[PDB]
Design a protein around this motif. Structure first.
Motif, PDB file in Angstrom:
ATOM      1  N   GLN A 105       0.827  -1.194   0.000  1.00  0.00           N
ATOM      2  CA  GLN A 105       0.000   0.000   0.000  1.00  0.00           C
ATOM      3  C   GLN A 105       0.870   1.257   0.000  1.00  0.00           C
ATOM      4  O   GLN A 105       1.939   1.284   0.615  1.00  0.00           O
ATOM      5  N   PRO A 106       0.433   2.312  -0.688  1.00  0.00           N
ATOM      6  CA  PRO A 106       1.209   3.558  -0.699  1.00  0.00           C
ATOM      7  C   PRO A 106       1.146   4.253   0.653  1.00  0.00           C
ATOM      8  O   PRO A 106       0.065   4.550   1.166  1.00  0.00           O
ATOM      9  N   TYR A 107       2.316   4.508   1.229  1.00  0.00           N
ATOM     10  CA  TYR A 107       2.437   5.210   2.498  1.00  0.00           C
ATOM     11  C   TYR A 107       3.211   6.502   2.280  1.00  0.00           C
ATOM     12  O   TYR A 107       4.351   6.475   1.799  1.00  0.00           O
ATOM     13  N   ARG A 108       2.591   7.625   2.633  1.00  0.00           N
ATOM     14  CA  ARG A 108       3.256   8.918   2.627  1.00  0.00           C
ATOM     15  C   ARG A 108       4.033   9.060   3.928  1.00  0.00           C
ATOM     16  O   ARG A 108       3.487   8.813   5.013  1.00  0.00           O
ATOM     17  N   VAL A 109       5.302   9.447   3.820  1.00  0.00           N
ATOM     18  CA  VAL A 109       6.225   9.468   4.945  1.00  0.00           C
ATOM     19  C   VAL A 109       6.877  10.841   5.022  1.00  0.00           C
ATOM     20  O   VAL A 109       7.331  11.381   4.005  1.00  0.00           O
ATOM     21  N   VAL A 110       6.919  11.400   6.228  1.00  0.00           N
ATOM     22  CA  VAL A 110       7.644  12.630   6.517  1.00  0.00           C
ATOM     23  C   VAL A 110       8.600  12.350   7.668  1.00  0.00           C
ATOM     24  O   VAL A 110       8.184  11.870   8.728  1.00  0.00           O
ATOM     25  N   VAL A 111       9.876  12.645   7.457  1.00  0.00           N
ATOM     26  CA  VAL A 111      10.909  12.494   8.474  1.00  0.00           C
ATOM     27  C   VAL A 111      11.240  13.882   8.999  1.00  0.00           C
ATOM     28  O   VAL A 111      11.646  14.763   8.230  1.00  0.00           O
ATOM     29  N   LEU A 112      11.048  14.084  10.300  1.00  0.00           N
ATOM     30  CA  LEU A 112      11.350  15.349  10.952  1.00  0.00           C
ATOM     31  C   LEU A 112      12.645  15.195  11.736  1.00  0.00           C
ATOM     32  O   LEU A 112      12.709  14.412  12.691  1.00  0.00           O
ATOM     33  N   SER A 113      13.671  15.938  11.332  1.00  0.00           N
ATOM     34  CA  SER A 113      14.967  15.935  11.995  1.00  0.00           C
ATOM     35  C   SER A 113      15.188  17.286  12.656  1.00  0.00           C
ATOM     36  O   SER A 113      15.143  18.323  11.987  1.00  0.00           O
TER      37      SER A 113
END
Lengths: 42, 49
Positions: free
Chosen positions: B21-29
């Motif tokens: 399934q398509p998963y939108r991912v945001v990585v906050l550093s």
């Protein structure tokens, strides 16, 4: 890393007198400054 | 032969399994340096007695 600018404006060589300078602007710049220059209008 | 384009296209479909399934991912550093930290959190103000 904090840039402090104090200003004072007065109506009138350096005049002889006393005038305290109130703080005007505080800036969180966080850069290294060792030289500067003025600007003029022609 | 032995030469491929480095980018492959994801073929997503609405009937695929959870593993595809398509998963939108945001990585906050979060980084802190010598400069004055400015990314602050909201401060809740209590009523004053």
């Amino acid at each position: 890393g904090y840039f402090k600018i104090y200003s004072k404006h007065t109506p009138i060589d350096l005049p002889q007198g006393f005038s305290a300078l109130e703080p005007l602007v505080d800036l969180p710049i966080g850069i290294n400054i060792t030289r500067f220059q003025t600007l003029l209008a022609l | 032969f032995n030469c491929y384009f480095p980018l492959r296209s994801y073929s997503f479909r609405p009937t695929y399994g959870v593993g595809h399934q398509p998963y939108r991912v945001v990585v906050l550093s979060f980084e802190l340096l010598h400069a004055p930290a400015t990314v602050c959190g909201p401060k809740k103000s209590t009523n004053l007695v």
